[PDB]
Amino acid sequence: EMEKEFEQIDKSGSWAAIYQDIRHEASDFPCRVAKLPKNKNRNRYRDVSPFDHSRIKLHQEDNDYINASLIKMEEAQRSYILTQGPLPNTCGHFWEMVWEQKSRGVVMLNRVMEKGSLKCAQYWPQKEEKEMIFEDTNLKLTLISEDIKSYYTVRQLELENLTTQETREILHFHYTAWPDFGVPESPASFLNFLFKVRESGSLSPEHGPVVVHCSAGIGRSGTFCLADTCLLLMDKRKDPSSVDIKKVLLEMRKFRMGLIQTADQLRFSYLAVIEGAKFI
């Protein structure tokens, strides 16, 4: 019946009106740590900041700030870390967060170069023979393997703590099929990407929360978590028709501002949940 709500919004063309209502009802919490002049160079965009109450704190004593937010969906029993694409000076902060939060999976929803512009920094090794060292941290990153497919790429990474010589396996799920303009016309490849992340066990609570990021960490990143959470709800509820995508999105926006950036991404999220529910 969520399909019925989709057909009626499509018929009246009210996707922009629906999305604008979501923006009007969205939570507004302070972001004072992010707006400190010390953390300007740690933010990719001045209008995309984490809330104080939900920001991920680095275990570094001097400056614990990273543009990342913890999303807790209690009923769906899932947690995500949403962050921006690492900057050239925050690549060590990124992997420090992954280590400290004990994350198993890293979900990347953008290409490094989209339409002749740098949307993200190369924070993982391109060659298996050359490791990456992050000086400000105690971390060593090594590319073990990668499986390249037409819509996404899965890489096996080894994160080593040089202090204790402890190593962890990090799975890197890189979705590469998102168009430079607009949204995918079909959610088939995006859903197959999500189910691939699910099957790896990375979303399971015995691991730390997965790190999901795009360019700013709100747009495509919101669609991944919104779709994943909405699919979990209608599978564990007695009445799957009680799931409201708008309600779930507003609940999500309590933890990070601006999730789902355009009415086009909102329509795509509807299409992914509808097709995903049909796929079960």
Question: What are the defining features of this structure?
Answer:
280 residues, alpha/beta, Protein-Tyrosine Phosphatase, Chain A, 9-stranded mixed sheet, 7 helices, 21% strand, globular
> What oligomeric assembly is this protein in?
monomer
What's the number of extended β-strand segments?
9
- First-residue to last-residue Cα separation: 15 Å
Tell me the CATH architecture.
Alpha-Beta Complex
CATH topology group? Protein-Tyrosine Phosphatase, Chain A
Gross geometry: globular
Rounded to an integer in angstroms, the radius of gyration calculated over CA atoms is 18 Å
**Number of DSSP helical runs:** 7
Q: SS-based structural class?
A: alpha/beta
Largest sheet: 9 strands, mixed
What fraction of residues sit in β-strands? Answer: 15-25%
CATH class: Alpha Beta
Helical content class: 25-40%
Could you state the CATH homologous superfamily? Protein tyrosine phosphatase superfamily
Order of helices and strands: HHEEEHEEEEEHEHHH
Number of domains in the coordinates? 1
Strand order of the largest sheet: 1-2-3-9-4-8-7-6-5
Describe the structure.
The protein has seven helices and nine strands; from the N terminus they run ααβββαβββββαβααα. It is α/β, with parallel strands linked by helices and 280 residues long. The chain has one domain (1-280): Protein-Tyrosine Phosphatase, Chain A. Strands 1-2-3-9-4-8-7-6-5 form a nine-stranded mixed beta sheet, with helices on both faces. A hairpin with a 3-residue loop joins β6 (139-148) and β7. The two termini are 15 Å apart. The PDB classes it as hydrolase.
